[PDB]
Amino acid sequence: GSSGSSGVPEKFKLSTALMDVLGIEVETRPRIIAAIWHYVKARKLQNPNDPSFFNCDAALQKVFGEEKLKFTMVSQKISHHLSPPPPSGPSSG
Template sequence: LSPDLAKVCGFEQHTRPQVVKQIWVYVKANQLQDPQDGRFILCNDLLRRIFE
């Protein structure tokens, strides 16, 4: 994983499903879900670097 993604997930290597699960844990812990539609993520600086 990239260094930024490893910060979000808490590990450097894992399966894709586990990485996706940890991203959602991070999103929920940091209240980054769109209040109008919880299917969308409001990226903070760290997530923005990962997804760009």
């Protein structure tokens, strides 16, 4: 066992651009992916041709850089942006 969901959940610090996309600071893995799912649709970014893909608004680019992306790929895209937030207390390992 190395990675999973033991005890408290997992939160990742949003990027400057990613933060300007949704407007958060410390969220989870899904909350974000979803936050993008909603936002996208919210901004009528959703793509008709492909229900899996979605158009970019302008802030989604700086994040990915592609005109459009998949609703699932975001996971394997936002991750890179995802970072470890500031923990509370001493640490070693």
